[PDB]
Design a protein around this ligand. Structure first.
Ligand SMILES: CC(C)Nc1ccc2cnn(-c3cncc(-c4ccc(C(=O)O)cc4)n3)c2c1
Length: 273
């Protein structure tokens, strides 16, 4: 019994992903996040190594489940008549990157470097596990404030990673690439790199670079804040109009701007404590 095992707390948020509550596992007092997803709102379904029909979100979370703390851990799940309930880990204290940037404004480059590197490691983990996130953005990144560790969350818009073209998308439009806007077609890795370019611009400028479809298609990057030449170069590279002109994850991590990254604990000591 789900109701027996967990003590429900406040609602942490709701939207396209469903409704997420703060919770406590009654057995060991472990902090958890309880996510409710309506069955009538689930368009992508999959199957587990045993053969049960579950939402794609559960399939993807199980594929990325490991000791690696860069991606949120699915602790358990339950089926109800009209919904699915996901028990997810909950860092404490925590703050999502959107709220962090809203509160603190544009981030110091040393902080953005540490955060961006951790996001890159989290996305590389997903891809290694055969999972494409499809909604990389500030709102889908939690900061574990004590450890300085970032956690990629919400696989509700995700898909199994494939090398062929994707012709469907239900992630965030302003983080979506020009090939999706113009042609309704994209390849997983190169679309992920575009979103990473939007995210990095967001970290160092305090806001996203493009609002309208026209701006995405033009892809002209204007820096509203003082940003180093190496960081601007990396951003402009990730935001190349042609998917084939975008860097690989290896090229991003070998970029001069990405050198001498702080450890997560060093990041918490300097910037979060
Ligand atoms: C509900 C999400 C999108 N946003 C959000 C905003 C603020 C907070 C504060 N804590 N918190 C939180 C803490 N631990 C875990 C989670 C969480 C974990 C997983 C998921 C998920 O969609 O996979 C959503 C949320 N959320 C928030 C979530």
């Amino acid at each position: 019994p789900l109701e027996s095992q967990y003590q429900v707390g406040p609602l942490l948020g709701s939207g396209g992903f469903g409704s997420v509550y703060s919770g406590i596992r009654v057995s060991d007092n472990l902090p958890v996040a309880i996510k409710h997803v309506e069955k009538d709102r689930i368009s992508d379904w999959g199957e587990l190594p045993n053969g049960t029909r579950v939402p794609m979100e559960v399939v993807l979370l199980k594929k990325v489940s490991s000791g690696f703390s860069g991606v949120i851990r699915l602790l358990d799940w339950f089926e109800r008549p009209d919904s699915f309930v996901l028990i997810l880990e909950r860092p404490e204290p925590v703050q999502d990157l959107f709220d962090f940037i809203t509160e603190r404004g544009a981030l110091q480059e040393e902080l953005a470097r540490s955060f961006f590197w951790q996001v890159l490691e989290a996305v590389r983990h997903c891809h290694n596990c055969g999972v494409l996130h499809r909604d990389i953005k500030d709102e889908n990144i939690l900061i574990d404030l004590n450890r300085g560790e970032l956690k990629l969350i919400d696989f509700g818009s995700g898909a199994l990673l494939k090398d062929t073209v994707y012709t469907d998308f239900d992630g965030t439009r302003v983080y979506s690439p020009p090939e999706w806007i113009r042609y309704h077609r994209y390849h997983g890795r190169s679309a992920a790199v575009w979103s990473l370019g939007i995210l990095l611009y967001d970290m160092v400028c305090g806001d996203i670079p493009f609002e309208h479809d026209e701006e995405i298609i033009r892809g002209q990057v204007f820096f509203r804040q003082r940003v180093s030449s190496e960081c601007q170069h990396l951003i402009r590279w990730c935001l190349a109009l042609r998917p084939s002109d975008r860097p690989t994850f290896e090229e991003i991590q070998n970029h001069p701007w990405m050198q001498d990254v702080l450890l997560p604990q060093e990041t918490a000591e300097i910037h979060l404590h």
